[PDB]
Amino acid sequence: EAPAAVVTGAAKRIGRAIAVKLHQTGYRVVIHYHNSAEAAVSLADELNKERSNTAVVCQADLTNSNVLPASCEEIINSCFRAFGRCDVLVNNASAFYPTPLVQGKTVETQVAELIGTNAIAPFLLTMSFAQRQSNLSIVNLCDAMVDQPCMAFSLYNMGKHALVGLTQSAALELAPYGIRVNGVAPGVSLLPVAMGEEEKDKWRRKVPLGRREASAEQIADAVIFLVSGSAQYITGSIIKVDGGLSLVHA
Amino acid sequence: EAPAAVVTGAAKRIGRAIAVKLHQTGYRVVIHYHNSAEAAVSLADELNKERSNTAVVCQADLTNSNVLPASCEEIINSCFRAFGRCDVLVNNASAFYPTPLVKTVETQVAELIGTNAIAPFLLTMSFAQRQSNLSIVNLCDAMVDQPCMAFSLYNMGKHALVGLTQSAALELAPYGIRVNGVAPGVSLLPVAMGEEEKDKWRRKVPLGRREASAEQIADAVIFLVSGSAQYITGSIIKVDGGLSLVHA
Amino acid sequence: EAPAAVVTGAAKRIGRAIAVKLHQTGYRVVIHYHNSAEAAVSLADELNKERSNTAVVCQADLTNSNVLPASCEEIINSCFRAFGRCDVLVNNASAFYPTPLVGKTVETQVAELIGTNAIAPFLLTMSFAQRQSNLSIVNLCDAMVDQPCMAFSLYNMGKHALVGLTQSAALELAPYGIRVNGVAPGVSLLPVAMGEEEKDKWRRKVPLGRREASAEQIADAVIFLVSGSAQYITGSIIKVDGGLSLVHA
Amino acid sequence: EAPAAVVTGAAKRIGRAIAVKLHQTGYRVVIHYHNSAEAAVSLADELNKERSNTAVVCQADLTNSNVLPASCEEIINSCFRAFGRCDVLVNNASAFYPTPLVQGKTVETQVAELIGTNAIAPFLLTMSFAQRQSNLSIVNLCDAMVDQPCMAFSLYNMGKHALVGLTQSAALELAPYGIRVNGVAPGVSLLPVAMGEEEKDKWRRKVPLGRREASAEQIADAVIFLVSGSAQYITGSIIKVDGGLSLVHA
Ligand SMILES: NC(=O)C1=CN([C@@H]2O[C@H](COP(=O)(O)OP(=O)(O)OC[C@H]3O[C@@H](n4cnc5c(N)ncnc54)[C@H](OP(=O)(O)O)[C@@H]3O)[C@@H](O)[C@H]2O)C=CC1
Ligand SMILES: NC(=O)C1=CN([C@@H]2O[C@H](COP(=O)(O)OP(=O)(O)OC[C@H]3O[C@@H](n4cnc5c(N)ncnc54)[C@H](OP(=O)(O)O)[C@@H]3O)[C@@H](O)[C@H]2O)C=CC1
Ligand SMILES: NC(=O)C1=CN([C@@H]2O[C@H](COP(=O)(O)OP(=O)(O)OC[C@H]3O[C@@H](n4cnc5c(N)ncnc54)[C@H](OP(=O)(O)O)[C@@H]3O)[C@@H](O)[C@H]2O)C=CC1
Ligand SMILES: NC(=O)C1=CN([C@@H]2O[C@H](COP(=O)(O)OP(=O)(O)OC[C@H]3O[C@@H](n4cnc5c(N)ncnc54)[C@H](OP(=O)(O)O)[C@@H]3O)[C@@H](O)[C@H]2O)C=CC1
Ligand SMILES: COc1ccc2[nH]c(NC(=N)N)nc2c1
Ligand SMILES: COc1ccc2[nH]c(NC(=N)N)nc2c1
Numbered sequence: 001e002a003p004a005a006v007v008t009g010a011a012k013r014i015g016r017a018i019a020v021k022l023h024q025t026g027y028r029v030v031i032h033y034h035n036s037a038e039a040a041v042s043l044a045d046e047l048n049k050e051r052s053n054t055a056v057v058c059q060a061d062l063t064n065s066n067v068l069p070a071s072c073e074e075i076i077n078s079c080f081r082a083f084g085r086c087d088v089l090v091n092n093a094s095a096f097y098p099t100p101l102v103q104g105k106t107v108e109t110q111v112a113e114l115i116g117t118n119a120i121a122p123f124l125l126t127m128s129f130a131q132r133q134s135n136l137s138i139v140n141l142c143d144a145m146v147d148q149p150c151m152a153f154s155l156y157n158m159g160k161h162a163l164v165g166l167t168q169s170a171a172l173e174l175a176p177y178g179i180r181v182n183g184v185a186p187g188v189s190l191l192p193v194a195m196g197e198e199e200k201d202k203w204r205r206k207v208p209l210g211r212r213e214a215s216a217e218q219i220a221d222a223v224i225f226l227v228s229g230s231a232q233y234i235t236g237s238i239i240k241v242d243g244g245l246s247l248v249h250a
Numbered sequence: 251e252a253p254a255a256v257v258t259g260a261a262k263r264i265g266r267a268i269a270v271k272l273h274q275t276g277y278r279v280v281i282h283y284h285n286s287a288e289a290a291v292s293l294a295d296e297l298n299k300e301r302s303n304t305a306v307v308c309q310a311d312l313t314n315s316n317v318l319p320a321s322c323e324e325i326i327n328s329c330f331r332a333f334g335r336c337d338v339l340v341n342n343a344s345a346f347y348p349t350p351l352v353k354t355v356e357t358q359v360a361e362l363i364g365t366n367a368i369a370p371f372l373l374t375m376s377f378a379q380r381q382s383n384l385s386i387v388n389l390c391d392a393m394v395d396q397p398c399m400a401f402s403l404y405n406m407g408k409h410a411l412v413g414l415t416q417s418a419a420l421e422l423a424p425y426g427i428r429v430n431g432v433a434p435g436v437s438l439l440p441v442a443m444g445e446e447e448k449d450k451w452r453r454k455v456p457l458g459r460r461e462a463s464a465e466q467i468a469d470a471v472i473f474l475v476s477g478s479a480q481y482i483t484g485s486i487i488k489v490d491g492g493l494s495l496v497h498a
Numbered sequence: 499e500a501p502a503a504v505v506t507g508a509a510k511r512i513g514r515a516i517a518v519k520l521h522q523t524g525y526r527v528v529i530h531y532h533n534s535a536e537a538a539v540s541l542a543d544e545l546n547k548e549r550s551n552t553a554v555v556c557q558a559d560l561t562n563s564n565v566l567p568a569s570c571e572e573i574i575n576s577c578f579r580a581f582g583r584c585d586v587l588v589n590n591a592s593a594f595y596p597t598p599l600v601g602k603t604v605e606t607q608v609a610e611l612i613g614t615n616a617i618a619p620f621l622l623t624m625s626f627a628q629r630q631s632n633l634s635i636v637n638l639c640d641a642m643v644d645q646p647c648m649a650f651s652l653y654n655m656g657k658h659a660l661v662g663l664t665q666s667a668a669l670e671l672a673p674y675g676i677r678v679n680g681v682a683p684g685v686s687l688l689p690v691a692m693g694e695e696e697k698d699k700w701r702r703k704v705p706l707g708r709r710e711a712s713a714e715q716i717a718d719a720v721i722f723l724v725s726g727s728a729q730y731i732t733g734s735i736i737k738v739d740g741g742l743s744l745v746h747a
Numbered sequence: 748e749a750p751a752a753v754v755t756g757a758a759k760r761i762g763r764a765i766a767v768k769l770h771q772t773g774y775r776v777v778i779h780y781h782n783s784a785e786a787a788v789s790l791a792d793e794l795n796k797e798r799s800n801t802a803v804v805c806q807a808d809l810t811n812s813n814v815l816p817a818s819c820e821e822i823i824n825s826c827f828r829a830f831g832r833c834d835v836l837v838n839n840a841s842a843f844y845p846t847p848l849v850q851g852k853t854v855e856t857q858v859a860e861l862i863g864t865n866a867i868a869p870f871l872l873t874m875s876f877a878q879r880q881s882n883l884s885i886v887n888l889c890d891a892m893v894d895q896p897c898m899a900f901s902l903y904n905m906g907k908h909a910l911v912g913l914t915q916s917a918a919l920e921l922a923p924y925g926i927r928v929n930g931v932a933p934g935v936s937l938l939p940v941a942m943g944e945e946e947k948d949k950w951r952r953k954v955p956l957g958r959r960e961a962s963a964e965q966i967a968d969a970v971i972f973l974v975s976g977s978a979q980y981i982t983g984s985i986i987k988v989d990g991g992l993s994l995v996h997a
């Protein structure tokens with residue numbers, strides 16, 4: 001049988017590109033989404049038209065709360081219910097917005113969303129994936145610029161740094177079970193939908209390799225490498241895919 | 251007149267050593283405590299005997315919750331109330347225990363991520379908002395990249411605190427607030443740990459085959475708050491006797 | 499037309515596996531070697547049997563000296579003379595032995611350990627870029643550089659320098675479309691003459707499978723980095739270490 | 748007796764400030780210099796006027812060559828000759844200039860000067876210091892920007908990375924002899940004499956903490972800390988003194 005992967009926040013953008021590339025490589029995919037129901041079903045429809053019964057959707061809020069563990073448990077369970085196995089987990093879903101230190105969500109909600117989606121949910125999903133258990137691995141979407149952060153993004157930066165810690169800790173602890181745990185760290189890839197072209201070009205111009213953002217496919221390419229048999233001895237590694245951005249001084 | 255400092259978890263061990271050394275350097279101090287009221291008070295008593303009305307205590311739980319923001323505001327306020335100013339914040343309080351991948355999990359999150367990361371962030375917010383040699387010092391961990399087996403939440407918390415150190419250094423630099431870290435390796439070992447396990451750790455340390463005293467940790471804190479560190483921000487000083495250099 | 503690659507120290511072990519895998523991927527290869535002439539030629543003959551006129555050998559000492567720059571220029575030149583192009587440079591050759599702080603002279607130890615691990619890569623990179631679809635350099639780094647073996651300071655210095663080169667060259671060559679990356683093994687092929695009981699001490703420390711990487715596993719990461727799947731990746735170093743570097747003392 | 752320190756490249760700028768501050772703390776000082784004979788002798792005069800017989804000069808080229816080991820041995824020997832002990836070594840001397848990868852000194856000379864001064868001479872001095880052996884320690888002047896380097900400075904950057912490696916390897920190997928080895932990593936401090944004012948101001952404006960370069964004295968302060976009794980458990984550590992510069996993205 002074909003292996004199966006869960007990709008979180010897979011309805012659009014980088015998460016879709018990953019689910020699509022995994023699907024093209026022969027994986028069955030759970031397309032997790034939160035709010036983007038139309039886009040999720042649309043993608044699953046496309047993949048199922050390509051090979052029937054190879055894609056399902058799974059809705060869940062990944063904000064931290066007392067029920068986040070159950071929701072993460074259910075995402076993994078969805079993969080086993082659909083396909084009878086779960087070989088790969090990609091932790092892609094992420095909230096991203098400013099939380100200035102010197103200052104209409106409460107700070108408690110910001111913490112829940114930015115730390116929950118970027119770090120706590122990846123942890124609980126990792127726990128569930130491991131407990132529910134060939135080439136098993138987890139790939140965490142990290143951030144190449146965590147050490148040179150955008151001004152006023154403390155909470156998002158904290159969550160991405162915690163995700164590096166999870167990557168290392170989980171690679172260590174799960175290696176005995178043959179589960180590898182690695183990261184992919186974009187620099188600038190698909191810019192935010194809300195960002196104007198002028199601001200987008202300011203970022204593009206900073207990138208040494210080509211003065212352009214990574215395509216979603218270029219990010220997926222690295223994920224596909226880490227899940228592949230060509231990475232069978234790689235665990236605890238985070239591959240930057242940033243066209244040299246993180247090497248550029250102020 | 252004299253500058254004032256808040257030290258979280260200051261009743262015992264490393265945070266006590268930090269409080270005492272700050273006091274000895276001429277700071278007035280807020281000794282924050284959670285469960286260790288008796289100890290916090292005994293320390294305040296010792297400090298006030300040295301110099302009258304230069305040490306107060308402040309109780310707060312730093313577990314993440316709907317009230318954590320209010321608690322953190324209160325800790326900072328208690329500094330301004332007692333002393334009229336708040337020059338230094340030392341984020342020392344910390345929970346530490348295993349959370350195997352294979353207390354409810356969400357309590358473990360609230361404690362491990364709340365004490366180690368979220369409370370530092372909220373205290374930092376309150377400290378900056380209420381604003382000279384202003385600085386914040388976060389107690390990190392030199393072994394974050396070579397973590398203890400089954401300690402993922404703790405490690406996540408400590409990595410998040412590195413993130414906070416950097417992001418806050420960047421954002422607060424315009425206000426003249428410096429933000430730095432001190433990363434112990436093995437210092438005062440956990441009360442719970444057996445004596446044989448303790449010696450196993452001591453033996454691994456290149457520099458002298460022993461743990462750091464609490465005062466050795468406090469020494470690095472004192473440097474970072476001093477006028478000798480006025481251009482230093484976003485730096486984390488390991489104080490680990492070379493432990494993190496030692497391969498498997 | 500087929501692309502071409504130079505692999506330094508390609509006669510044996512990891513560099514051999516890299517040359518083979520590049521050849522399998524459709525590259526013509528320059529097999530650089532220092533002392534291992536018989537192994538290099540054997541490899542070239544094997545490759546040429548697979549596909550005629552796709553492999554040459556090139557002898558050179560990579561120890562630091564006033565002739566090192568000329569040597570390095572000649573290695574790159576040999577690829578252009580054999581194949582008309584040079585698409586990929588793999589800085590694999592490396593000396594590795596203890597240099598305690600407290601029977602070669604120290605200046606020899608410096609020339610060999612810094613020359614092979616750092617200076618020769620720099621000179622090869624300069625010659626590669628000066629001579630210029632999908633150009634890239636891959637440097638063989640070391641996952642354990644921040645947790646070094648006792649009494650290996652010169653080796654460790656050389657490998658950290660190579661990190662610096664990887665970063666500095668990625669930045670500087672990115673406008674020419676040349677990517678520069680690294681692959682950092684932890685423990686891979688150990689000396690054949692090292693006792694199994696000592697090899698097992700290292701094997702036991704690796705989380706992922708309690709074994710060293712094969713040379714082929716290291717080569718797989720090189721192949722990824724030179725591939726079209728890594729078109730946006732520059733300045734990156736991929737650890738291929740089975741989680742060894744994550745293990746505390 | 749008073750402890751003694753060697754400071755390489757101590758005639759001017761940051762090395763001079765370290766020598767002065769060590770002297771102020773109680774140390775006897777060897778002022779190593781290469782070309783700056785007048786400024787070296789002038790500094791030694793000033794310190795000796797303050798406390799007689801507490802400063803000597805020592806001339807040496809730190810370019811790599813087959814005789815660099817003997818010159819390094821000579822620098823340490825000169826400390827023992829003057830003061831009968833050598834407690835502290837400060838590796839401060841450094842060449843710094845561009846070495847572009849793509850097109851009056853030969854490349855052989857560039858390597859010898861940039862790798863010799865920044866790395867090989869530190870190693871040889873460390874070896875001589877250790878071989879001749881209270882509170883013993885070495886401090887290497889590193890560079891906070893080594894992961895976000897200046898364009899076309901590959902050989903310099905390679906040398907400074909090697910110096911980080913040396914700091915770690917020697918901290919490990921010398922810990923059993925009670926010798927601690929640490930680094931101080933400036934961002935922008937005293938800017939190059941040859942740099943125009945507009946370019947100096949460009950650099951200043953990048954620094955978050957104050958929009959200005961470090962004083963030599965601020966760099967020296969961290970050196971003083973690391974050699975002091977307040978750093979007795981610190982080895983293998985590199986303290987950035989960069990005003991946040993390395994945190995700033997492109
Ligand atoms: N884009 C870039 O330039 C960079 C990206 N990255 C990382 O790469 C990954 C992909 O980036 P990108 O595609 O731009 O990500 P997006 O900003 O597009 O977010 C991906 C998905 O995350 C989901 N998500 C957000 N909040 C929640 C929540 N509370 N619960 C559940 N799901 C949620 C959303 O699903 P839905 O729409 O269904 O609600 C969204 O579609 C992320 O981890 C990101 O941090 C890192 C650096 C740069
Ligand atoms: N000891 C070591 O070897 C090492 C220490 N460190 C770091 O150094 C710092 C000091 O370490 P150490 O002195 O051993 O720490 P402790 O484990 O002794 O914790 C310090 C204090 O934190 C307070 N604390 C714990 N949980 C909470 C909570 N939920 N709310 C409020 N306060 C709480 C407690 O105060 P109370 O007693 O009042 O309840 C406790 O006394 C920590 O940040 C630690 O992670 C890092 C690496 C090694
Ligand atoms: N093996 C491992 O576990 C690890 C390897 N690495 C790195 O991976 C790479 C490959 O490793 P491995 O296969 O073990 O390497 P080897 O020890 O087999 O070295 C590769 C080749 O380097 C060449 N070389 C040595 N000295 C010189 C010199 N002075 N001039 C020219 N060439 C010279 C030799 O060529 P010849 O035989 O022709 O004389 C040798 O065959 C190296 O860069 C190494 O540091 C990193 C970490 C661990
Ligand atoms: N200034 C800054 O902004 C920064 C400095 N640093 C580091 O801090 C340290 C001090 O910086 P700075 O004061 O600017 O250094 P300088 O550029 O002023 O160099 C210090 C001294 O090094 C000596 N030196 C140079 N070449 C040789 C050689 N071949 N042999 C022997 N000595 C030599 C010179 O001695 P003489 O005059 O006697 O010939 C020179 O005065 C250096 O390691 C530097 O890389 C790091 C980052 C930023
Ligand atoms: C400004 O370009 C960026 C840099 C980092 C980012 N991280 C994310 N994460 C996300 N969840 N969208 N988007 C980014 C966009
Ligand atoms: C095993 O020695 C350690 C290693 C890391 C630690 N972190 C903490 N933190 C704490 N809050 N006690 N204690 C430690 C004790």
Ligand SMILES: COc1ccc2[nH]c(NC(=N)N)nc2c1
Nearest residue numbers: 591592593594640684685686700
């Ligand atoms: C522990 O075994 C090792 C670790 C690192 C190494 N680096 C190298 N380099 C080399 N040129 N062989 N060999 C090694 C062997």
Ligand SMILES: COc1ccc2[nH]c(NC(=N)N)nc2c1
Nearest residue numbers: 840841842843890934935938939
């Ligand atoms: C451009 O400002 C800098 C940044 C790094 C430097 N390193 C040095 N080193 C030196 N030997 N002068 N000078 C520098 C000047």
